[PDB]
Amino acid sequence: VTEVEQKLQIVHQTLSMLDSHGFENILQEMLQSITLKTGELLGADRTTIFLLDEEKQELWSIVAAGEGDRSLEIRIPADKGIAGEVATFKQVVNIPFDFYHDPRSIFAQKQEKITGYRTYTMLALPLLSEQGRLVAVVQLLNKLKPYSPPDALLAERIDNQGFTSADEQLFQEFAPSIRLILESSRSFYIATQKQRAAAAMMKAVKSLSQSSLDLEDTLKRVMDEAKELMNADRSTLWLIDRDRHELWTKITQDNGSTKELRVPIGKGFAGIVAASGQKLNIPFDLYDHPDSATAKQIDQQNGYRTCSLLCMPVFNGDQELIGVTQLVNKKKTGEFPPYNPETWPIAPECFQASFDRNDEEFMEAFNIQAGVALQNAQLFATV
Amino acid sequence: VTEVEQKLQIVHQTLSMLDSHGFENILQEMLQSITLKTGELLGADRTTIFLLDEEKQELWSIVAAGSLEIRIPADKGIAGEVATFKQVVNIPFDFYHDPRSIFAQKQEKITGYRTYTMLALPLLSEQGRLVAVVQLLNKLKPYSPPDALLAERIDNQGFTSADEQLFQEFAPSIRLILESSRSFYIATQKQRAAAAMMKAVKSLSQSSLDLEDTLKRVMDEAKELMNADRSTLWLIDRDRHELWTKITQDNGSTKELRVPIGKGFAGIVAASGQKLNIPFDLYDHPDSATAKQIDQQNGYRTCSLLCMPVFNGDQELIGVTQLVNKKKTGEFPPYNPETWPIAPECFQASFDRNDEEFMEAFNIQAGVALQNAQLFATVK
Numbered sequence: 001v002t003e004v005e006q007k008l009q010i011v012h013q014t015l016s017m018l019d020s021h022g023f024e025n026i027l028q029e030m031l032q033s034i035t036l037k038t039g040e041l042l043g044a045d046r047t048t049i050f051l052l053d054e055e056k057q058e059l060w061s062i063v064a065a066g067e068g069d070r071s072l073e074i075r076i077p078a079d080k081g082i083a084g085e086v087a088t089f090k091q092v093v094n095i096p097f098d099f100y101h102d103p104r105s106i107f108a109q110k111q112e113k114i115t116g117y118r119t120y121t122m123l124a125l126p127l128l129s130e131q132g133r134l135v136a137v138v139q140l141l142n143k144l145k146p147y148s149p150p151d152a153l154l155a156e157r158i159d160n161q162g163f164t165s166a167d168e169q170l171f172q173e174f175a176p177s178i179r180l181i182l183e184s185s186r187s188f189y190i191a192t193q194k195q196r197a198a199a200a201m202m203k204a205v206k207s208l209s210q211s212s213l214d215l216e217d218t219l220k221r222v223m224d225e226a227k228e229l230m231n232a233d234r235s236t237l238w239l240i241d242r243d244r245h246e247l248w249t250k251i252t253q254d255n256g257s258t259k260e261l262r263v264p265i266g267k268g269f270a271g272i273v274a275a276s277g278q279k280l281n282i283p284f285d286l287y288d289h290p291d292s293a294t295a296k297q298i299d300q301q302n303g304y305r306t307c308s309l310l311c312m313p314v315f316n317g318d319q320e321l322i323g324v325t326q327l328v329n330k331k332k333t334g335e336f337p338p339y340n341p342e343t344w345p346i347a348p349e350c351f352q353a354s355f356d357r358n359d360e361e362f363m364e365a366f367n368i369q370a371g372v373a374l375q376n377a378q379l380f381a382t383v
Numbered sequence: 384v385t386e387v388e389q390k391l392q393i394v395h396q397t398l399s400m401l402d403s404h405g406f407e408n409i410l411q412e413m414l415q416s417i418t419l420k421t422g423e424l425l426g427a428d429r430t431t432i433f434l435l436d437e438e439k440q441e442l443w444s445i446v447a448a449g450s451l452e453i454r455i456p457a458d459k460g461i462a463g464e465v466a467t468f469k470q471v472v473n474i475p476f477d478f479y480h481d482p483r484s485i486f487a488q489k490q491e492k493i494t495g496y497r498t499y500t501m502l503a504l505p506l507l508s509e510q511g512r513l514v515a516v517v518q519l520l521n522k523l524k525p526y527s528p529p530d531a532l533l534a535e536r537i538d539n540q541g542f543t544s545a546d547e548q549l550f551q552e553f554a555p556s557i558r559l560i561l562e563s564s565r566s567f568y569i570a571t572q573k574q575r576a577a578a579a580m581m582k583a584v585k586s587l588s589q590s591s592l593d594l595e596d597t598l599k600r601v602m603d604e605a606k607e608l609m610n611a612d613r614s615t616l617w618l619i620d621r622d623r624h625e626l627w628t629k630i631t632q633d634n635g636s637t638k639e640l641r642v643p644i645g646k647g648f649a650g651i652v653a654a655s656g657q658k659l660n661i662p663f664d665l666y667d668h669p670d671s672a673t674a675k676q677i678d679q680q681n682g683y684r685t686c687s688l689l690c691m692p693v694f695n696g697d698q699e700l701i702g703v704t705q706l707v708n709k710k711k712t713g714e715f716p717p718y719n720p721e722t723w724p725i726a727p728e729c730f731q732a733s734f735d736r737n738d739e740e741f742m743e744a745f746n747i748q749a750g751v752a753l754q755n756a757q758l759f760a761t762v763k
């Protein structure tokens with residue numbers, strides 16, 4: 001309560017040390033240099049660092065050796081390959097010559113047909129936090145003989161004895177520095193997210209104390225601000241009717257009309273999010289999505305057209321879902337005439353656009369402010 | 384690695400929500416209003432919200448309704464009991480007949496307020512951590528004549544089970560204000576920590592300094608920002624059970640200092656793992672014997688000191704930093720060792736707890752350099 005201003009000065013100093021300095025590049029370039037040196041010292045032809053996108057269940061390479069020292073991004077399902085084995089069970093996997101005689105290599109053999117790279121031997125290592133969380137998977141490919149002709153083909157340059165126990169321990173000279181880059185950035189992301197959530201709650205307290213508006217009008221202001229920042233045509237807060245197992249809301253049209261909408265939980269994108277507690281971001285054109293039947297019927301009834309949609313859950317203090325926000329129709333940049341319902345179901349060019357991952361992160365502060373208001377506005381009014 | 388720019392834009396969103404809006408006053412005034420309403424509805428003469436300062440081990444009032452700041456040892460009184468055992472305490476009339484009231488009876492001689500009944504409730508998080516102690520005093524009769532004395536307007540049947548339940552209508556709102564602000568404070572400090580690690584990666588990637596000079600650069604920046612005369616990084620001889628460091632004197636000299644772990648402020652902090660902030664004048668402190676001897680040997684004088692632990696990956700101690708002598712702003716004569724033990728005016732100042740929080744970023748940068756500077760240079 002009494003440290004806000006001082007902590008804001010600390011935030012400003014954090015911005016001074018990071019803003020405009022190209023830290024994504026500094027961090028990625030250093031990671032690349034470490035990986036190169038790690039591979040050189042362990043005698044690997046190629047060295048890859050995989051990260052885990054747990055939202056999409058995929059391992060993707062933040063650093064990965066390519067042909068002619070120009071690198072590409074490898075992306076696989078998090079359960080597949082030796083990389084997936086290391087991600088799941090968090091053991092070192094050492095594959096001796098020849099990897100292709102191992103039945104675990106089937107996935108890799110299919111990927112070779114595309115990449116043109118041939119893996120004979122491998123050392124794959126989990127990078128773990130102190131708690132044992134997966135930070136990354138480091139994969140070293142094709143142990144090399146220390147001396148080969150400079151024009152030698154891969155099959156002649158490989159060392160049939162593969163990677164050794166001494167190589168695995170040598171990797172520990174580098175492991176801490178790799179962890180530092182990956183863990184420092186991750187920790188920055190999480191702290192920034194928790195800081196934002198806390199700030200959004202504080203801002204909601206300020207709104208409720210200073211306003212002489214209803215709950216209804218306070219929630220409208222939050223959704224209208226969200227809509228403006230994200231360049232959405234409309235926005236909506238759906239509330240739960242627990243008794244009937246339904247969502248409801250009151251929309252306002254281009255007319256001067258107040259219409260109530262009601263959808264069963266489980267039906268439509270709002271209903272799906274209410275049932276699952278998990279966001280959905282539906283890109284243009286929403287009408288091509290297999291779950292769009294509900295939108296099609298409501299659009300025709302309202303003289304509107306839903307083309308893109310960001311649907312996110314709103315929670316309690318104790319993880320109970322109490323609402324669902326929607327941003328409706330990311331606006332394409334430019335000037336266009338208003339939508340005319342006589343053209344249905346044709347999508348107007350003005351809504352040929354989609355919400356992205358940035359819109360999702362920026363919307364979260366508005367979701368939190370809505371939730372705080374729903375839970376606390378009645379007590380705040382009494383006071 | 385690939386989300387730094389997006390997250391920095393989130394930091395700017397956060398600043399736009401909070402900057403220049405007088406939030407310390409908005410939050411405190413709302414907390415005050417909710418406390419007033421809570422006391423009115425439960426019929427308490429007075430209502431207090433205590434917070435726990437963990438480092439000083441004190442309970443202190445952020446709000447009082449029915450106003451001064453009350454401050455007690457964290458283990459004393461009914462408030463202390465609720466902070467420790469985390470259960471509701473309902474005291475019937477008359478509180479003073481209860482042995483547990485002795486502390487309050489002594490506080491009463493000072494404040495002049497007389498407590499007859501009480502309901503003290505723990506406010507807890509999901510995990511069972513203490514957020515606050517809410518203490519309601521002196522249940523009132525629903526009607527008393529306009530100018531009735533306190534003894535005449537108290538209800539001698541005290542607070543009810545229903546009063547306890549009615550409090551839960553206000554508890555969530557109180558939690559919101561206290562927890563949201565706390566979460567912002569902790570997230571901000573953890574964000575600076577991670578930012579300082581990233582900054583170290585930048586420094587070590589673009590550096591041509593060896594380990595010794597890298598560590599000196601970190602400590603020199605630390606003393607510049609917090610206006611200390613000198614600064615020091617002690618390393619551990621984990622073998623002789625000793626600390627060592629190489630100081631540079633105002634002259635152009637190098638000198639090794641050795642302290643047994645356990646002795647001196649550096650040694651105490653190494654054996655315990657807890658920071659110490661020794662205010663002016665450090666020579667008045669019980670544990671200052673080592674500083675006094677070392678000062679005479681160096682022709683120096685230690686007047687204030689901020690001594691902090693430095694850890695590796697898994698929270699094992701790899702060093703101790705010191706900022707030495709917060710400098711008084713102005714222009715003063717150089718310290719002359721012939722004046723010993725007189726403290727010079729240039730060092731008549733102290734480090735505050737804001738310096739402690741800012742210094743953590745340099746502590747982390749030193750720890751990162753110890754573990755990574757040599758490898759980074761090899762790759763470069």
Ligand SMILES: Nc1ncnc2c1ncn2[C@@H]1O[C@@H]2COP(=O)(O)O[C@H]2[C@H]1O
Pocket residue numbers: 046047048064065066074076080081082083084104105107108111115117119139141
């Ligand atoms: N840098 C790289 N270049 C080409 N192929 C790679 C690279 N890194 C990993 N791979 C291959 O990608 C495969 C994914 O499945 P595996 O992990 O079983 O085996 C992996 C390697 O054979």
Ligand SMILES: Nc1ncnc2c1ncn2[C@@H]1O[C@@H]2COP(=O)(O)O[C@H]2[C@H]1O
Pocket residue numbers: 234235236251252261263267268269270271292294295296298299302304306326328
């Ligand atoms: N503010 C709004 N104005 C008009 N239609 C809306 C608005 N918000 C949501 N909708 C529509 O309401 C529909 C409910 O089901 P869906 O979530 O599938 O798709 C939703 C949109 O098509």
Ligand SMILES: Nc1ncnc2c1ncn2[C@@H]1O[C@@H]2COP(=O)(O)O[C@H]2[C@H]1O
Pocket residue numbers: 429430431447448453455459460461462463483484486487490494496498518520
């Ligand atoms: N707002 C207040 N005004 C006067 N006295 C108070 C107030 N709040 C708490 N106290 C007294 O401070 C005492 C501290 O010890 P106890 O918790 O035993 O009992 C507490 C009350 O008697």
Ligand SMILES: Nc1ncnc2c1ncn2[C@@H]1O[C@@H]2COP(=O)(O)O[C@H]2[C@H]1O
Pocket residue numbers: 613614615630631640642646647648649650670671673674675677678681683685705707
């Ligand atoms: N850079 C420095 N220059 C001179 N004295 C120092 C320096 N750093 C630490 N000291 C002194 O070294 C002493 C070691 O024991 P203490 O930590 O008790 O107190 C410390 C200070 O008095």
